[PDB]
C-alpha cells in the first residue's frame, strides 16, 4: 500500500509558527492539531459547532485553523431519517477562529468504531461522509442500503439480520415490535455485529 503523507494540514497563512497546544481556560483540556473541538455557536440554545483543529497559532492571542464539521440539519439537504443523532459530515469548509471560542473537546469516531462503543457519551460523534459545503455533494456519493425501506444504516435504530439474506431489517418494517425482536432466538426473513461490519452493495 503506497500513499503520501501531506506535510501541512492547513493552506492558509502557513507563514506563522505553530503552537504545539492550547489549554482551554480554567480546565485541564489540552487541544492539539488533529483534535476535534466544540465551539459556541452564534445563535443561543443551539448545539455547539464541531470542528477539527488543523493548526494552532498566536499573535502579539491564540488562533485556530478549523475544518468545520456539519450537522445533518446544518447541511444543504438537511437531516434525513437515516442520519444518526451524533452523525457529522467532514466538510472542506475552513475558517480561522479565536481559540477562546473553544468550549470543550469531543471525539469524532469512524462509523465502525462508533458502532462498537460500549457507551455513547455526550462527546462521542461519528462521521462517514465528507461534504462539499459549496455544492452539498457527499463523498462517497453511494452507500449500502438495507431492509424493505431500502435505507442506509442508522446506528440509532435496532436492526436484525436474516439468517438467509444477511440483509438487515427494522423490526417495524417486518411487522414486529422492538421487544419481540430483542427476544428472538433466530430470525429468517420472509424474502427468504452491525451493518457497518458488512461488505457488499451500494446505492446513491
Amino acid at each position: 500500500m503506497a500513499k503520501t503523507r501531506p506535510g501541512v494540514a492547513s493552506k492558509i497563512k502557513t507563514g506563522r509558527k505553530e503552537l504545539d497546544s492550547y489549554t482551554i481556560k480554567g480546565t485541564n483540556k489540552v487541544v492539539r492539531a488533529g483534535d476535534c473541538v466544540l465551539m459556541r455557536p452564534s445563535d443561543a440554545g443551539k448545539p455547539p459547532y464541531v470542528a477539527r483543529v488543523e493548526k494552532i497559532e498566536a499573535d502579539a492571542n491564540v488562533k485556530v485553523h478549523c475544518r468545520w464539521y456539519y450537522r445533518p440539519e446544518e447541511s444543504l439537504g438537511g437531516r434525513r431519517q437515516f442520519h444518526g443523532a451524533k452523525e457529522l459530515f467532514l466538510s472542506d469548509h475552513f475558517d480561522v477562529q479565536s481559540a477562546h471560542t473553544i468550549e470543550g473537546k469531543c471525539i469524532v469516531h469512524t462509523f465502525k468504531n462508533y458502532t462498537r462503543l460500549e457507551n455513547v457519551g455526550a462527546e462521542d460523534y461519528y462521521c462517514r461522509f465528507e461534504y462539499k459545503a459549496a455544492t452539498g455533494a457527499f463523498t462517497p456519493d453511494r452507500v449500502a442500503v438495507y431492509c424493505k425501506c431500502e435505507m442506509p444504516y442508522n446506528p440509532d435504530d435496532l436492526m436484525v439480520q436474516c439468517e438467509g439474506c444477511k440483509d438487515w431489517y427494522h423490526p417495524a418494517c417486518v411487522g414486529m415490535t422492538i421487544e419481540e425482536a430483542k427476544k428472538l432466538d433466530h430470525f429468517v426473513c420472509a424474502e427468504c455485529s452491525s451493518p457497518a461490519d458488512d461488505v457488499k452493495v451500494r446505492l446513491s
Partner: peptide, 8 residues
Amino acid sequence: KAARKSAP
C-alpha cells in the same frame, strides 16, 4: 467567545 463562520 462566540464563533462566526465564514460563508462556504
